Amino acid sequence: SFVVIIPARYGKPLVDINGKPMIVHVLERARESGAERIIVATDHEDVARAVEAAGGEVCMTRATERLAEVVEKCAFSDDTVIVNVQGDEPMIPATIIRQVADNLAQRQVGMATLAVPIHNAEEAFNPNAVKVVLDAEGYALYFSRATIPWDRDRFAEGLETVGDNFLRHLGIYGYRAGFIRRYVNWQPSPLEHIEMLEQLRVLWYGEKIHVAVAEDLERVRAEM
Amino acid sequence: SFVVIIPARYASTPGKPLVDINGKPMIVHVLERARESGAERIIVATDHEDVARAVEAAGGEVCMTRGTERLAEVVEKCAFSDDTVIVNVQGDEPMIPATIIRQVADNLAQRQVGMATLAVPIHNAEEAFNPNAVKVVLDAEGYALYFSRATIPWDRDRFAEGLETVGDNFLRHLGIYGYRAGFIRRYVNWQPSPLEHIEMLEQLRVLWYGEKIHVAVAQEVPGTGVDTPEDLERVRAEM
Amino acid sequence: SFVVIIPARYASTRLPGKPLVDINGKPMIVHVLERARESGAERIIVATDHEDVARAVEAAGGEVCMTSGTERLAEVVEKCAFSDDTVIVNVQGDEPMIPATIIRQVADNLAQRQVGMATLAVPIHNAEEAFNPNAVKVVLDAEGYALYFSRATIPWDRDRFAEGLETVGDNFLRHLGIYGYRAGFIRRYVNWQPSPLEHIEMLEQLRVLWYGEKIHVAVAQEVPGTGVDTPEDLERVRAEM
Amino acid sequence: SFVVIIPARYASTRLPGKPLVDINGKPMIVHVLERARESGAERIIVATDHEDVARAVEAAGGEVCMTQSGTERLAEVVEKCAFSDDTVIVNVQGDEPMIPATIIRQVADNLAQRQVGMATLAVPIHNAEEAFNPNAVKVVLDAEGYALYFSRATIPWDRDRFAVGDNFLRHLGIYGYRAGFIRRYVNWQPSPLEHIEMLEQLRVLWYGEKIHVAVAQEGVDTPEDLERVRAEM
């Protein structure tokens, strides 16, 4: 029992992939997941019409904090499990959306994300690839654009190679409507502005984040 | 009430613990600092008997050992209560301001947490980008979120094109710790975490086992430790 | 701002055409509509599948929605296309004397809590009711949220019942069937796969608790007279008004 | 990773000196101490107010903490040891020497995995005797397995069939808590409901916290029991 809200800023939402707009592919993924309700949050009528054409529900928003807007308009109860799922991943498997919802429900954490192993040095050293370090229980310690965990010895010698310990954070956030409300009631944290990672506000205010281990010119076109 | 344990290291590119600094060995200067802090008991952990005699002659206490396992052998040998707060202070810091030794003790005394430590602001970008300087990122209450040799937190916009300059938010972690005797035993009992060996950072084991570490900005910025002859003159001249 | 929906069941073994039964000059359904107007509801909708009921209600200026209890409410929520944040209070058409004030209360309670549902309860003073499976007991947390609803006697007073079951304390609460919920919730509740607990106790509010949602419960501000399905109940009510 | 505390209940109307009862060559509590060792606990403390039990436990290389609610007794051990708030404690009774070591570990895993305050266990009830027995605590879980309520009353109530079945869960007396949750627990004011049901865990539910209940279809107070256990071990 969960709801999917897809934040689509805006021109990425409508970029074509294979006869469908980027956003439509994510709605199909959200829909394949079993979600009871699939809302696309937009600030544009070009997007709101593409999704509307598609038979997908739409909530207009100003131009996670966008999800707080939707949560308020739909008046969701604090207990409603919400899975973010960004509009930038049109091929995200329908099962990791479920995984994220289920993990959040199993546990009583405030936020549930997902990460994927990095098997590439270029990715590990890319400040656009967000890295996450985990404790033994899978809870996150930190999220950063820095290369963490820093492998001292191998990087003492070189940066053309990477071990098998890096985890790439994906933008699929599980959380309760009550948590989003709390999220936006907190004063923005200083750490979130330096890294430019919304996720850090939750760590700044002492909340935990469970992490399960599953933009530009693309090859996605080929992949699907 | 808190205890101070001073591990007197010897490893160094010479005869460190006993090196003279204006008439007294360096190890006795660290002892004086620990007394200044109000510790009710200062123990020097050493394996060399000549180091032992210098401490004893100064009226200090000594626990012959066989660098944190050293600490545990001392809590072992002294049968300290679990609740006993212990502050590990370095044998090569003759000028360690006593205020900070007290600061860690009190910080730890006040929180129901595993470890307590200190950090200092980083002003030079060289230091921010040097892996031998450990960086630490805090939560709204000073609990370490993470310790790293990578530059964290990552300044997105400022670092976008290389690393030339630095903001004012960076924190360099000081290797001065506080903990209960019970916690030192657990810590040392644990199986080494995968994380601590990747970063080569003992403190990561604490976070890995889902325990917390409280960090504070040192009340006074600590003079550097003494490991080179040029540091000795710096020290000797300074004291 | 809130909406009242009044399910009108024509059907009734011991009382045929019950919504239209005459009570001191007007049809029962109409009396319920009056109570609901007294509550301050902005919109009152009588849900019926009979044209005659609808005519009775329209004659007295009432709005009608031509249509499994909760499911029936969903049809109405559908056809009226209520907005999600719309507060609905379900009031039975068998209750011509339901105190207007408890209708307001459920709405007021729901209005400031982001809860799935809001309900009411009444103190149980006799041990017969406490031990009566037909009386549904509810046990609340410190903030008025239901821990559990049951036909069993809860909370169980272990030291007292070790002695005897012919007397109770002041810790018992009889659950009342008047509910408050937002239209967004109703239209979701209704597609949930029936909970296994639900079927054992034969309590459908157990579906909310089983899915991890909350049910706010407050002590009704007034004790409601019971419904009307018996011909004897009809004369009684006839006499009380 | 996790600590185990074994309250060595001494008194028993029918069984005097429980902890030191020989069960095939070893006192009852030592057997419990071995189950906790097999569990993988990193530390096992026996909570007792008797010198006999303290000597038996110590002779066996076990740790002892010489110690008004039961959960308050755990609290004394917690202050005595000075565990950090994050420390995971698993409370295991000294009168259950057959307690499989993996349910102990299971309770510990559940609490660690779930960021909840308390974790516990339950097993299916099969016969009507137990289901209608007020000393047999029934619990009713939600879809995610979190407790809805604990009662000495027969819940859930089978309307038609009671006017036994197959959806009844009996609560076990083993808990997983963090050290910070025992202090919070202990500082709260007693709830009005715990006293009516005479159930300590109801306090948790009255203050809005959650209780995770795991199910695993798998207690020595009387002489009958000593034999049922001796003659099974």
Short mmCIF file of C-alpha atoms in Angstrom, two decimals, chain C residues 134 139-142 147-148 150-159 171 197 200-201 209-210, chain D residues 134 140-143 148-149 151-159 167 193 196-198 205-206:
data_model
loop_
_atom_site.label_atom_id
_atom_site.label_comp_id
_atom_site.label_asym_id
_atom_site.label_seq_id
_atom_site.Cartn_x
_atom_site.Cartn_y
_atom_site.Cartn_z
CA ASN C 134 -22.21 -6.70 20.25
CA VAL C 139 -8.56 0.93 23.74
CA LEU C 140 -6.75 4.23 23.16
CA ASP C 141 -3.17 5.47 23.44
CA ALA C 142 -2.47 8.69 25.39
CA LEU C 147 -4.72 0.77 19.87
CA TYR C 148 -7.23 -1.87 18.79
CA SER C 150 -12.54 -5.71 19.44
CA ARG C 151 -15.60 -7.68 20.40
CA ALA C 152 -13.50 -9.00 23.28
CA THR C 153 -13.51 -7.25 26.67
CA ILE C 154 -10.58 -4.81 26.56
CA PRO C 155 -8.74 -3.52 28.22
CA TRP C 156 -8.81 -6.66 30.35
CA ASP C 157 -8.80 -5.66 34.04
CA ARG C 158 -6.79 -8.59 35.39
CA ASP C 159 -7.04 -8.05 39.17
CA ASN C 171 -11.73 2.33 31.75
CA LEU C 197 -8.14 -9.45 11.21
CA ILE C 200 -12.24 -12.64 12.27
CA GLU C 201 -13.55 -9.86 14.49
CA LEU C 209 -5.08 -0.45 11.85
CA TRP C 210 -3.78 -3.48 9.97
CA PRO D 134 -5.43 -14.69 31.05
CA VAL D 140 -2.41 -8.85 17.42
CA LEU D 141 -0.01 -7.60 14.77
CA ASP D 142 -0.43 -5.37 11.75
CA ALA D 143 0.58 -6.24 8.19
CA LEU D 148 -1.46 -3.33 17.57
CA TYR D 149 -2.15 -4.36 21.14
CA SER D 151 -4.01 -8.30 26.10
CA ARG D 152 -4.82 -10.93 28.72
CA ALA D 153 -8.19 -11.01 26.97
CA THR D 154 -8.74 -13.40 24.05
CA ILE D 155 -7.87 -11.25 21.02
CA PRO D 156 -8.63 -11.25 18.27
CA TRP D 157 -12.16 -12.17 19.26
CA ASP D 158 -13.80 -14.79 17.03
CA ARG D 159 -17.36 -13.46 16.86
CA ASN D 167 -5.00 -16.79 14.00
CA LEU D 193 -3.41 1.01 30.80
CA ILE D 196 -5.30 -2.37 34.26
CA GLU D 197 -3.95 -5.19 32.09
CA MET D 198 -0.85 -5.69 34.27
CA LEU D 205 1.92 1.53 23.09
CA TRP D 206 0.26 4.16 25.29
#
